Scaffold this active site. Structure first.
Site, PDB file in Angstrom:
ATOM      1  N   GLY A  20      34.663 -33.419 -35.475  1.00 42.34           N
ATOM      2  CA  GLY A  20      33.406 -33.007 -37.046  1.00 42.34           C
ATOM      3  C   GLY A  20      32.324 -33.507 -36.197  1.00 42.34           C
ATOM      4  CG  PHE A  21      27.967 -32.474 -35.240  1.00 44.86           C
ATOM      5  CD1 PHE A  21      27.528 -33.640 -34.557  1.00 44.86           C
ATOM      6  CD2 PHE A  21      26.496 -32.323 -36.794  1.00 44.86           C
ATOM      7  CE1 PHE A  21      26.156 -33.963 -34.095  1.00 44.86           C
ATOM      8  CE2 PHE A  21      25.199 -33.015 -36.122  1.00 44.86           C
ATOM      9  CZ  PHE A  21      25.227 -33.436 -34.593  1.00 44.86           C
ATOM     10  CG  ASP A  50      31.041 -35.514 -42.960  1.00 45.49           C
ATOM     11  OD1 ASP A  50      30.374 -36.383 -42.623  1.00 45.49           O
ATOM     12  OD2 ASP A  50      32.142 -35.567 -43.381  1.00 45.49           O
ATOM     13  CE1 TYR A  55      26.402 -40.055 -46.087  1.00 43.14           C
ATOM     14  CE2 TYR A  55      27.156 -38.052 -44.650  1.00 43.14           C
ATOM     15  CZ  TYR A  55      27.679 -38.441 -45.273  1.00 43.14           C
ATOM     16  OH  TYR A  55      28.765 -39.710 -45.500  1.00 43.14           O
ATOM     17  CE  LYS A  84      31.516 -37.492 -46.352  1.00 41.53           C
ATOM     18  NZ  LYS A  84      30.587 -37.206 -45.058  1.00 41.53           N
ATOM     19  CG  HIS A 222      24.832 -45.840 -39.560  1.00 45.34           C
ATOM     20  ND1 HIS A 222      24.522 -46.779 -40.401  1.00 45.34           N
ATOM     21  CD2 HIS A 222      25.587 -45.645 -39.871  1.00 45.34           C
ATOM     22  CE1 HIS A 222      24.837 -47.128 -41.176  1.00 45.34           C
ATOM     23  NE2 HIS A 222      25.964 -46.071 -41.874  1.00 45.34           N
ATOM     24  CE  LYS A 270      23.480 -39.791 -35.668  1.00 41.19           C
ATOM     25  NZ  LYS A 270      22.245 -40.668 -34.526  1.00 41.19           N
ATOM     26  CD  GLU A 274      19.506 -30.548 -24.723  1.00 36.94           C
ATOM     27  OE1 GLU A 274      18.742 -30.493 -24.297  1.00 36.94           O
ATOM     28  OE2 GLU A 274      19.513 -29.815 -25.039  1.00 36.94           O
ATOM     29  CB  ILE A 277      24.984 -33.753 -29.020  1.00 39.59           C
ATOM     30  CG1 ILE A 277      24.436 -33.994 -30.244  1.00 39.59           C
ATOM     31  CG2 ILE A 277      25.642 -31.979 -29.195  1.00 39.59           C
ATOM     32  CD1 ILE A 277      23.427 -33.125 -30.881  1.00 39.59           C
ATOM     33  CD  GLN A 279      29.231 -38.579 -23.158  1.00 43.10           C
ATOM     34  OE1 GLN A 279      30.010 -39.422 -23.852  1.00 43.10           O
ATOM     35  NE2 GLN A 279      27.937 -39.329 -22.667  1.00 43.10           N
TER      36      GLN A 279
HETATM   37  N1  NAP Z   1      32.438 -41.401 -46.165  1.00 48.18           N
HETATM   38  C1  NAP Z   1      31.160 -42.119 -46.036  1.00 48.18           C
HETATM   39  O1  NAP Z   1      31.351 -42.935 -46.741  1.00 48.18           O
HETATM   40  C2  NAP Z   1      30.833 -42.091 -45.262  1.00 48.18           C
HETATM   41  C3  NAP Z   1      30.032 -43.234 -43.610  1.00 48.18           C
HETATM   42  C4  NAP Z   1      29.373 -43.846 -42.736  1.00 48.18           C
HETATM   43  C5  NAP Z   1      30.068 -42.322 -41.769  1.00 48.18           C
HETATM   44  N2  NAP Z   1      30.224 -41.029 -42.200  1.00 48.18           N
HETATM   45  C6  NAP Z   1      29.881 -40.121 -41.389  1.00 48.18           C
HETATM   46  O2  NAP Z   1      30.410 -40.225 -39.971  1.00 48.18           O
HETATM   47  C7  NAP Z   1      29.862 -40.317 -39.553  1.00 48.18           C
HETATM   48  C8  NAP Z   1      29.624 -40.327 -38.114  1.00 48.18           C
HETATM   49  O3  NAP Z   1      29.763 -42.333 -38.280  1.00 48.18           O
HETATM   50  P1  NAP Z   1      28.249 -42.544 -38.196  1.00 48.18           P
HETATM   51  O4  NAP Z   1      27.251 -41.460 -38.163  1.00 48.18           O
HETATM   52  O5  NAP Z   1      28.022 -44.401 -38.703  1.00 48.18           O
HETATM   53  O6  NAP Z   1      28.079 -42.983 -36.390  1.00 48.18           O
HETATM   54  P2  NAP Z   1      29.347 -43.123 -35.194  1.00 48.18           P
HETATM   55  O7  NAP Z   1      30.097 -41.538 -35.168  1.00 48.18           O
HETATM   56  O8  NAP Z   1      29.988 -43.692 -35.270  1.00 48.18           O
HETATM   57  O9  NAP Z   1      27.984 -43.282 -34.068  1.00 48.18           O
HETATM   58  C9  NAP Z   1      27.530 -44.158 -33.840  1.00 48.18           C
HETATM   59  C10 NAP Z   1      26.285 -44.530 -32.611  1.00 48.18           C
HETATM   60  O10 NAP Z   1      27.240 -43.479 -31.385  1.00 48.18           O
HETATM   61  C11 NAP Z   1      26.182 -42.825 -31.143  1.00 48.18           C
HETATM   62  N3  NAP Z   1      27.049 -42.441 -29.810  1.00 48.18           N
HETATM   63  C12 NAP Z   1      26.759 -40.647 -30.090  1.00 48.18           C
HETATM   64  N4  NAP Z   1      27.914 -40.405 -28.554  1.00 48.18           N
HETATM   65  C13 NAP Z   1      27.491 -41.110 -27.835  1.00 48.18           C
HETATM   66  C14 NAP Z   1      27.881 -41.178 -27.064  1.00 48.18           C
HETATM   67  N5  NAP Z   1      28.598 -39.795 -26.522  1.00 48.18           N
HETATM   68  N6  NAP Z   1      27.793 -42.017 -26.488  1.00 48.18           N
HETATM   69  C15 NAP Z   1      27.198 -43.829 -26.782  1.00 48.18           C
HETATM   70  N7  NAP Z   1      27.064 -43.362 -28.086  1.00 48.18           N
HETATM   71  C16 NAP Z   1      26.489 -42.215 -28.392  1.00 48.18           C
HETATM   72  C17 NAP Z   1      24.860 -42.358 -31.794  1.00 48.18           C
HETATM   73  O11 NAP Z   1      23.244 -42.621 -31.110  1.00 48.18           O
HETATM   74  P3  NAP Z   1      22.775 -41.180 -30.467  1.00 48.18           P
HETATM   75  O12 NAP Z   1      22.373 -40.023 -31.912  1.00 48.18           O
HETATM   76  O13 NAP Z   1      21.411 -41.522 -30.059  1.00 48.18           O
HETATM   77  O14 NAP Z   1      23.173 -40.021 -29.823  1.00 48.18           O
HETATM   78  C18 NAP Z   1      25.242 -43.563 -33.133  1.00 48.18           C
HETATM   79  O15 NAP Z   1      24.129 -43.234 -33.721  1.00 48.18           O
HETATM   80  C19 NAP Z   1      28.448 -39.973 -39.946  1.00 48.18           C
HETATM   81  O16 NAP Z   1      27.283 -39.209 -39.433  1.00 48.18           O
HETATM   82  C20 NAP Z   1      28.587 -39.537 -41.595  1.00 48.18           C
HETATM   83  O17 NAP Z   1      28.342 -37.512 -41.156  1.00 48.18           O
HETATM   84  C21 NAP Z   1      30.327 -40.493 -43.878  1.00 48.18           C
HETATM   85  C1  STR Z   2      26.152 -43.025 -44.373  1.00 48.12           C
HETATM   86  C2  STR Z   2      26.416 -43.948 -44.572  1.00 48.12           C
HETATM   87  O1  STR Z   2      27.234 -44.731 -43.613  1.00 48.12           O
HETATM   88  C3  STR Z   2      26.339 -44.447 -45.974  1.00 48.12           C
HETATM   89  C4  STR Z   2      26.993 -45.749 -46.550  1.00 48.12           C
HETATM   90  C5  STR Z   2      26.352 -46.624 -47.543  1.00 48.12           C
HETATM   91  C6  STR Z   2      24.687 -45.442 -47.696  1.00 48.12           C
HETATM   92  C7  STR Z   2      23.645 -45.668 -48.372  1.00 48.12           C
HETATM   93  C8  STR Z   2      24.072 -47.080 -49.207  1.00 48.12           C
HETATM   94  C9  STR Z   2      22.768 -47.414 -50.200  1.00 48.12           C
HETATM   95  C10 STR Z   2      21.268 -45.959 -49.989  1.00 48.12           C
HETATM   96  C11 STR Z   2      20.814 -46.040 -50.901  1.00 48.12           C
HETATM   97  C12 STR Z   2      19.582 -45.055 -51.300  1.00 48.12           C
HETATM   98  O2  STR Z   2      18.584 -45.483 -52.566  1.00 48.12           O
HETATM   99  C13 STR Z   2      18.952 -44.359 -50.260  1.00 48.12           C
HETATM  100  C14 STR Z   2      20.451 -43.876 -49.435  1.00 48.12           C
HETATM  101  C15 STR Z   2      20.884 -45.331 -49.301  1.00 48.12           C
HETATM  102  C16 STR Z   2      20.209 -45.901 -48.123  1.00 48.12           C
HETATM  103  C17 STR Z   2      22.577 -44.835 -48.523  1.00 48.12           C
HETATM  104  C18 STR Z   2      22.476 -43.982 -47.067  1.00 48.12           C
HETATM  105  C19 STR Z   2      23.692 -43.521 -46.556  1.00 48.12           C
HETATM  106  C20 STR Z   2      24.593 -44.867 -46.279  1.00 48.12           C
HETATM  107  C21 STR Z   2      23.827 -45.664 -45.318  1.00 48.12           C
END
Ligand code: NAP
Ligand code: STR
EC number: 1.1.1.-
Length: 323
Positions: A20-21, A50, A55, A84, A222, A270, A274, A277, A279
């Protein structure tokens, strides 16, 4: 497996792509960036996308998806889109309005998956994280089983094809599973999962109940402050991941993604870059040996990047339990 379009069958008969993206970007990233990135993701072969109301990107992500449907790149049926329900809309009567609001922003008629984002309820209103004077979060008392019932009605209405949860612990999953008159099991539990926090116990539990574990922050997150401790170890700098990357002529990120695919986990990734993504979809091109999977298992070190500890306190805070 070996094809980037590979899916897993959910417990409600729907199919979810195993890669997933991820669309979340830190606050400081201009909101325009989500549009181009999502378009690039679809062009690269991502189908599972996703997001979430929290977000603040659904308008842009929706624009990107619809643009790719309009130009013939993909059909709606081939996109698996997740939204969500945020904590300010846990009250049963507020669940459907929240989903409808997301759908209005997306300009889509349904989501493929709707999740309860996080088990702690906060006071209803426009503010996603309500605070009083003094900066203390205003919590609300809501029966999560009642929330689930309202989410089930969204599936009945056809607004969400599948329904699930996120950041739920074992006890919370059991509360839903054991609910009198349960209509639909959650199809998934989306949780933090990577080689530093591999979730073995929760993974096994989800599998035992026909619940898919979906890994977020699978590349180490992130690292946005203050949600993630800036002094935490950087996953992608891991010497073992780097050594495995060199051996396979891949990258640490690709090793981290492949690890999840081979252990029965659906994995998010995430990127707004370009090259990265493109890769990330190459994860389907190679295989890790059993010995290498074991080596990655050894990286486990109880590093949880997203503690969400601002929500600590209420009994529904999910990360206090062992799992
Ligand atoms: N359910 C929840 O509470 C929750 C919480 C956290 C996250 N999420 C979801 O999960 C997704 C992913 O988690 P995340 O946003 O924490 O990030 P992640 O997928 O763990 O990635 C973190 C970082 O990796 C870098 N990256 C991506 N591909 C790479 C590669 N091939 N080589 C080197 N670096 C690479 C990205 O930077 P670049 O963009 O510069 O490439 C990104 O900032 C979120 O966007 C969200 O949709 C959900
Ligand atoms: C996807 C991400 O991990 C989530 C986990 C905790 C979340 C944050 C929790 C605190 C928060 C408060 C806000 O009022 C804006 C959104 C934010 C800044 C959230 C953005 C999305 C976050 C960063």
């Amino acid at each position: 497996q070996d094809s980037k379009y590979q899916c897993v069958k959910l417990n409600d008969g729907h199919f979810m792509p195993v890669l997933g993206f991820g669309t979340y970007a830190p606050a400081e990233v201009p909101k325009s960036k989500a549009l181009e990135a999502t378009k690039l993701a679809i062009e690269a072969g991502f189908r599972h996308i996703d997001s979430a109301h929290l977000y603040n990107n659904e308008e842009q992500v929706g624009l990107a998806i619809r643009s790719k449907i309009a130009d013939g790149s993909v059909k709606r049926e081939d996109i698996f889109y997740t939204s969500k329900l945020w904590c300010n809309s846990h009250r049963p009567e507020l669940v459907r309005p929240a989903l409808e609001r997301s759908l209005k922003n997306l300009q889509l008629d349904y989501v493929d998956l709707y999740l309860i984002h996080f088990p702690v309820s906060v006071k209803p209103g426009e503010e996603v994280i309500p605070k009083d004077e003094n900066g203390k979060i205003l919590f609300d008392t809501v029966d999560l089983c009642a929330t689930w019932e309202a989410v089930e009605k969204c599936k009945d209405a056809g607004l969400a094809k599948s329904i699930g949860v996120s950041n739920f612990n074992r006890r919370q999953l059991e509360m839903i599973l054991n609910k009198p008159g349960l209509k639909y099991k959650p199809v998934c539990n989306q949780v933090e999962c990577h080689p530093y926090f591999n979730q073995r116990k929760l993974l096994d539990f989800c599998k035992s109940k026909d619940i898919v574990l979906v890994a977020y922050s699978a590349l180490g997150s992130h690292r946005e402050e203050p949600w993630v401790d800036p002094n935490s170890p950087v996953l992608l700098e891991d010497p073992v991941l780097c050594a495995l990357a060199k051996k396979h002529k891949r990258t640490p990120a690709l090793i981290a993604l492949r690890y999840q695919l081979q252990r029965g986990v659906v994995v998010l990734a995430k990127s707004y870059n370009e090259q990265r993504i493109r890769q990330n979809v190459q994860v389907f091109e190679f295989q890790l040996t059993s010995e290498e999977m074991k080596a990655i298992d050894g990286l486990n070190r109880n590093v949880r990047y997203l503690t969400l500890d601002i929500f600590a306190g209420p009994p529904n805070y999910p990360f206090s339990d062992e799992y």
